Amino acid sequence: MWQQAIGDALGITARNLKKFGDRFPHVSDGSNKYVLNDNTDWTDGFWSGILWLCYEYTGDEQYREGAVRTVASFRERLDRFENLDHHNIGFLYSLSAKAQWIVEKDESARKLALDAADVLMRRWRADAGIIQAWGPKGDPENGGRIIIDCLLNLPLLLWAGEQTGDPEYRRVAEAHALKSRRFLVRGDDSSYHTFYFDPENGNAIRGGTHQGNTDGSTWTRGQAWGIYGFALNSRYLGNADLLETAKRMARHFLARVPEDGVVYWDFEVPQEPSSYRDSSASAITACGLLEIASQLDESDPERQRFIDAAKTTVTALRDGYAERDDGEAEGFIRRGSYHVRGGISPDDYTIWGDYYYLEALLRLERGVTGYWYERGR
Ligand SMILES: CC(=O)N[C@@H]1[C@@H](O[C@@H]2OC(C(=O)O)=C[C@H](O)[C@H]2O)[C@@H](O)[C@@H](CO)O[C@H]1O
């Protein structure tokens, strides 16, 4: 039921690895070909994650060799501090360096991940009690802003905390997670994309977005980041409240899935066929659902209900958005959207979409849970 889907992904990945060389895929832009970069964006780690997933499934060394090469690329990126002045250090190094340590216990990868965790830690603003999303410290407009995406970048810190025994990692991680729950999540279980606090004291100011339709809409990927993100912090912290929030945001998402099973880019715009979609949001959510389920009690009937929703979602992605390995297609799933309001790849492949789509398949077929935490933790 999942072998066929995985099969096409494996084939597409093998071809890409040869085609791309040492370059990294980000998103497509009006075609079945990925636009590449020299490891300079926030999405580069997803390529690494895909390669490590393919290796774990097949045992095929060509995948492992490609992943190892990206790790070397990440060491260079880190020791040069190239475009890392943001919170996405987690997405970047959890799926690359920490991934290798999770897969084969490579001490060298472990240290790199730890090195990367230290840099991310210096993004914490004591006065505001948050981890700054974008820009250098004190940035006039972003110095006190947090984003729901950041929840997915906390696993790197939490993992490092357990690795080093340094309590500060978990302290700042839990604090930021709770702050996010109070201000980014809304009363109807929906969510804001970003939230602003007073840099001087950390007082709440306002919620808002630059990727969602309006400050008060629900950017589906934002919601997705929340679902999976809160569930991941929930696991590390053993926080029943964060888990509850994950489930709330999940149920909200599920009740707004359109007919073909894959969501539009924002829940608060007309849910019409001519509107852009965001397959990546559905992909992230499928993983979120499985993570939540994995934390529930067996007697919890909602557990199987989430697993089934995750399956239905992956199946929906497979039947309507997945690319068959036709020798040309470079992406796993179509119709992802990067920045709709901005006009940037609103109907294309997204490397993160591809990663979560595969992680979902690996979770469902082999019980392989990705690289957010140690296997068996
Ligand atoms: C480093 C940075 O700020 N990059 C911008 C992008 O931000 C990323 O967006 C997403 C996403 O899911 O789309 C996830 C990351 O958490 C976040 O840092 C994004 O805003 C993009 C839109 O055009 O612009 C980049 O500059």
Ordered by where they begin, the domains of the chain are 1-377 (1.50.10.10)
Atom 5 (ligand 1): residue with closest C-alpha? 42
State the CB neighbour count (10 A cutoff) for residue 272.
8
> What is the spatial distance between Cα 106 and Cα 42, in angstroms, rounded to a whole number?
24
> What is the spatial distance between Cα 317 and Cα 197, in angstroms, rounded to a whole number?
37
Name the strands in the sheet holding 145-147, side by side, starting at the edge strand that comes first in the sequence: 145-147, 194-197, 204-208
State the CB neighbour count (10 A cutoff) for residue 21.
10
Q: Is 363 in the pocket of ligand 1 (CB under 6 A)?
A: no
b/e sequence 280-296, b meaning 16+ C-beta within 10 Å: bbbbbbbbbbbbbbebb
Residue from 366, 364, 360 nearest 333 by CA: 360
> Are the C-beta atoms of 353 and 28 separated by less than 8 Å?
no
Rounded to 5 degrees, φ, ψ at 36 are -110, 160
- Cα of 304 from ligand 1 centre, angstroms: 33
**Reported structure resolution in angstroms:** 1.9
Q: Is 323 in the pocket of ligand 1 (CB under 6 A)?
A: no
> What is the spatial distance between Cα 170 and Cα 174, in angstroms, rounded to a whole number?
6
- Cα of 181 from ligand 1 centre, angstroms: 21
Helices and strands per DSSP (H, E), number in the chain: 13, 7
> Are the C-beta atoms of 33 and 81 separated by less than 8 Å?
no
Cα three-residue angle 290-358-17, rounded to 5 degrees: 160
Task: Give the determination technique.
Answer: X-ray
